[PDB]
Amino acid sequence: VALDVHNAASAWSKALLDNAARPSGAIIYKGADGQGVLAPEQYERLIFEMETHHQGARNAGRPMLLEGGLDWKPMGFSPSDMEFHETKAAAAREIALAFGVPPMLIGIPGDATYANYAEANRAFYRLTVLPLLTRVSAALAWWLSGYLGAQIELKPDLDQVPALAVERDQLWARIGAAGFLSNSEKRVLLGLPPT
Amino acid sequence: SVTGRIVAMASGAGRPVWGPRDTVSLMRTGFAGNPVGFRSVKLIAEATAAVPLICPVLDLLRRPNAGQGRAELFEALIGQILLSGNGYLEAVCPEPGVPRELHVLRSDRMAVVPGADGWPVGYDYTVGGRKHRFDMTGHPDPICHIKSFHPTDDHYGLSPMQAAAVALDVHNAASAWSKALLDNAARPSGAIIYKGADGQGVLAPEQYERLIFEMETHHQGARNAGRPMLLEGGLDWKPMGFSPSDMEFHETKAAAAREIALAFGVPPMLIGIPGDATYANYAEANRAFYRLTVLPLLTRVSAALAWWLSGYLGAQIELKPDLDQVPALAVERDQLWARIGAAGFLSNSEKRVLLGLPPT
Amino acid sequence: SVTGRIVAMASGAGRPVWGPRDTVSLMRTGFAGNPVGFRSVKLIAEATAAVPLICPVLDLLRRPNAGQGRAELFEALIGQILLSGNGYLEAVCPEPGVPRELHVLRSDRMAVVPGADGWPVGYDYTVGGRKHRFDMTGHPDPICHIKSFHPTDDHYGLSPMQAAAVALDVHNAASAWSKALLDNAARPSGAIIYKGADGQGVLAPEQYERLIFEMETHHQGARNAGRPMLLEGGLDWKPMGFSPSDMEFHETKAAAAREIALAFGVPPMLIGIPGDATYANYAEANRAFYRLTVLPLLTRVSAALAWWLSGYLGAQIELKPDLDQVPALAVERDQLWARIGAAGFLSNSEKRVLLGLPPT
Amino acid sequence: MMLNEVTAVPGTALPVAEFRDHLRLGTGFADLGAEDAALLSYLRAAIAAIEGRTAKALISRGFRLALTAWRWGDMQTLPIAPVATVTALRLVDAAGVETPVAAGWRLVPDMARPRIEALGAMLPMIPTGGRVEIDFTAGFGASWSALPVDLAQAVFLLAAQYYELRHDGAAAMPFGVMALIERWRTVRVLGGRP
Amino acid sequence: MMLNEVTAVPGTALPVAEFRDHLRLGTGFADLGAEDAALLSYLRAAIAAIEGRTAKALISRGFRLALTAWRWGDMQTLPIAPVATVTALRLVDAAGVETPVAAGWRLVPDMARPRIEALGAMLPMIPTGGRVEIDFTAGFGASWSALPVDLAQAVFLLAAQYYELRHDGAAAMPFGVMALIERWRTVRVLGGRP
Amino acid sequence: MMLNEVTAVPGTALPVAEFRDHLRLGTGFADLGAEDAALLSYLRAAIAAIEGRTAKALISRGFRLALTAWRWGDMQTLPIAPVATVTALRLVDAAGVETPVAAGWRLVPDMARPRIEALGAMLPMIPTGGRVEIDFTAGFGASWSALPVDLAQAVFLLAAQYYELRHDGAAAMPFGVMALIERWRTVRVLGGRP
């Protein structure tokens, strides 16, 4: 549902910029009657004084004498910005919600949930990547072991993946500062080959 | 490979498969047309060319051909992958091993041939009505075909510009909205209405040149701003406005300018678009840029050069990005050197093997 | 290569190919026309000239010719690349090696010739109706042709001004909107409406000079601001307003003033345009400027001078930017010296070799 | 752009014998007495009021459209709407050498927007000072019977009004004069540069 | 798009002898025929008024629709609404040769949208600089009796009005002239590109 | 969708002898003199004004509804409202093989929305180019007496009005013509895609 909102709200603004007639005004010419056209002699006079002397940046604001019958009604454009702007941006967040990516990584706008990308990249490799990768690798560990004789395990590294460095600072400085237990007693905790 | 034969017959073996027609028009309307699509590819293609590589073979990559340097090659190579999802590299071999010419063939004029077993047998460089028919029915296989991931197609890539092709046309037309609004708009700063005794009445060209000369001299311009302007009977001055003044599709352009930057994967802070502060202080956004959309792209192309060029050599060569002395990753390098450097319990050579140093 | 031979005969061998039509008009409307497009090129072209180089040959670069210095050469060279996507350098060689003249040929009046095998044989300098026909059918090849990346064209560059050509015409016309609005506008500060006994009636020129002189003396000006202004029968004062007062295309100009700065790649903080704070404190935005749009641009031109000028020498020379003692990269140099200087585990000579020092 | 008529109506093409019947036939005083050539002078005044409000021609008179510069690149909409067969697109120069052209343009007829619409993108350029000049025959048919009869009734509703009361005296019909004209007026919404 | 008529109505198909019953002229006089020259002059002036307000045809005379470029890629809605049996889409060339084409075009009958939709996804192409005239006979029936009677009444309410007042003199019914017409007008809401 | 009537009324089914009594019976000049076949021509004009405003049929004439594509998947609301017994749903192809169907659909009668409403979800598909065609008999009853009498009075209030005054002349009744019709008009509020 959130794809079809985001696809059609984005295509709303495309076809609004492509099918829209806004005028910057309208020179209403009634006449002596309630209705009256102006002759093509008068009409090319009316274009050429509008083409040359009134349109464009360089003619912005000429005082524009209006004789009897003529009148200039300036039109507006009342919804100018923001055509389904928030409902697209809410749907652009629900698509990112379903796959599980944070809004900060993909680049969609929104309120600051995560702080400073040491978290949101660490949240990305912990809620929707490494649970996904440890589930496929558990199936390659069993399907490919059916071709071998001995069964093999196959898991993600969960080490030297640089989005999990904030979980690695936090665990090395905890045990490195624990001075009570000895040197070889903490190489076995951090995953080191003991000496 | 066993199922390869079944998909080949449906497409038709020995016949060129084209894929997307409108590929050449997204280039002129989305990469030569708007700055956001222009800057996003130029920001990536000049970043992947700057990253050094780790292996001989790199002597070819350093000087591929005349007039097309090492860094200029990957800008042409990645610049086709981001634009049309496909990268091509012709190798010209006067010599049998390590062919001394590389040429990025543009992917507008290249077409695949499915062949017998589904994997390609021909590539067709089609300029004008002229074809070439490169052959893949051999061992060296003279063109590496780098695909972006496409789930539905079996022969091409997806080209992120195609995924942002609606948001490009919003940004192209909202920017051209304000251009043609500044070029087609009649605003007056007022209107001197002259009705007359009747409901309608013109004023004589004697009176009309009198009306210009008191308007030309005494009322228009900066220096006559605010004259008290006597209006006799019949005359009246109705001042017009311009009711939407700023901001003609200003936020929908600024939202589409971010969705273009979203698809190519650049952060909004690097390209320069306005927007809410997502990343903080450029130590993150430059590090996020070389980790989510540059180094995954470069390690995928370099993995195809590591295998295509090793087919010309005897021994297979690995070829990966350096991920060291690339100065956008210094916050991941401070963080890893100060972690192990502060671990005083393990000895000197026990952390040179961790940080990657040759031990002494 | 092989594809190129086919490409030539499509366009036509031996005949000049011109490329962009409007590149002579984008210069006057986009570089002499608006300050944002003017400053953006001047910000980059004066940055690439300031970067030192690493190699004899640089003695040519220091003094190329009379009246055109080292820094003045690259301002002319990069100033053609940013404007029209192409850089040209004529070399005059009285001597066989290291030709003692360099000349930035402007890219308005230069045209390529595809030649036989697709790679160029002729360049045509066309001023007026007069040509020169430089020849590329030799080894020294007297013009280096520096291309910006263009995916659709085979002979020219893309020229970021072409990608910002809509945002230039918005910024040129919105700025000229406010100019001609301050020059063509009649606002009155009021209107003394005089109807009369009839619906229409003029006032006699005896009465009218009485009406000016009581308005000229007693009501206009700062010193007469607010007189109580008795209105007898028939007379009436309708004060006019001016309903859009400020802000005529103020944000659409300021959004277009950012998209011009976006396309050339300068940050908004360096050039001085207003906008939301993306970069923080100029140690980043100047470091971002010399890393995303200057040093990738400078290492691409210097890689072409390293190969074109080595065709005049016997031995090939490398020529790269210094990437050292360029004072915008000091935050990448603090960050790397304090990392290894604080790493006390590895010895003294083991870190002089990392930081780039001559070892002791 | 002067657009003077080459020839006017003959006068014998106008339905004066029929307008006497729309004035008083089947009901009335008798045939009565009407200055015959007066009744021709009110038909020419009612047609020329409807030729101006509708920009039609109604009798298929010959025209001469002599204008200096082409408005579009190629289009050149003709003002008098029901056209047929450009007589000539002769092109005079500033001195009067009057060199006609015979190809390069194909008149595309239409009651809405008659055009010249040259072949490709090249319409005959103008000698500097030498106005271009287009002679054409515009209108429905040669006789009065070839007209749309609703437009012919708007002449008879109007020419009888100029006969029934002379000065501008005061007097809302469902299909009046104005309601029969409005499907022949030109509906334009351009006030722009093209 | 010119849309002229090949043949007009015969005049003998118009119900002058029944319109005379409507207007209450007289029953058994020996003259009985002093108005025949003018009664059908107002019936043709009231049908042609309702043929333009409704875009209907009412006598099924033959038409000729000479146009040059197709309005939409395949559809080509015809203006005169109640159609049957499009005769010929003869495709003229740039000049001269007129080749009638079966061409694989269909006809979708409707009172609202009388399309000419093509079956091969593209109507027969048009020689650049040449028109494509379509002969078709459009209307309700051949005689007056085959009409919808309310539209036939709207002619009699209107042509009686032209007979009773000659010039534009001003003078509320439940189903007047206008309220009978309005279920036969064309209701359109597109001002767009397609 | 042409929807022409197969046969019209016979004329002898209309209450001309009763409409003379609604015109002047019990009060009046005498029976007076009325062109009998004229009075039949105003009843057919008042019924056809109320057949159009109500979309009813009132005499139970035979219809032929020949339309190209089905609007819904299965529904197909019939326009002329009081229906009974589809004669045939014959299906012609692009060449005219005219293969009727005899099952697969069950007409669901109703004065509001008469339907075709095929069984399940499969309604007979259309041969490409070969328009489907539905013949049905729609209306209240064969004689004038089978009508709702309030709708019959709206004919007599209207057909007398076309008899009493000929041209469109000006003249708020509680149950007038318009108030007797409004409970037989079709009340629709869809302007949408289904």
Numbering used by the authors:
A (entry chain A): 199 to 393
B (entry chain B), C (entry chain A): 24 to 78, 89 to 393
D (entry chain C), E (entry chain D), F (entry chain C): 1 to 171, 175 to 197
Please share text taken word for word from the publication where this structure appeared.
Gene transfer agents (GTAs) are DNA-containing phage-like particles produced by some species of bacteria and archaea. The genes encoding proteins that form Rhodobacter capsulatus GTA particles (RcGTA) are derived from phage DNA, which has been integrated into the bacterial genome. Here, we use cryo-electron microscopy (cryo-EM) to determine the structures of RcGTA before and after DNA ejection, and to visualize the interactions of RcGTA with R. capsulatus cells. Particles of RcGTA have heads with a diameter of 38-nm and 49-nm long tails.
The dodecamer of the adaptor proteins provides the binding site for a hexamer of stopper proteins, resulting in a symmetry mismatch between the two complexes. Adaptor loops from two neighboring adaptor proteins differ in their conformations and interact with one subunit of stopper protein. The first adaptor loop is oriented parallel to the tail axis and fits into a cleft within β-sheets of a stopper protein, whereas the adaptor loop of the second subunit is wedged between two stopper proteins. A hexamer of RcGTA stopper proteins (Rcc01689, g7) binds to the adaptor complex. Each 112-residue-long stopper protein interacts with adaptor loops from two neighboring adaptor proteins. At the distal interface, the long and insertion loops and C-terminus of the stopper protein bind to a terminator protein. However, the long loop of the RcGTA stopper protein interacts with the tail terminator protein and does not block the central tail channel. Furthermore, the end of the DNA packaged in the native RcGTA particle extends through the channel formed by the hexamer of stopper proteins and continues into the disc of tail terminator proteins. A hexamer of tail terminator proteins (Rcc01690, g8) binds to the distal interface of the stopper proteins. Unlike other tail proteins of RcGTA, the tail terminator protein contains α-helices 1 and 2 in its N-terminus. α-helix 1 binds to the insertion loop of the stopper protein and α-helix 2 interacts with α-helix 3 from the same tail terminator protein.
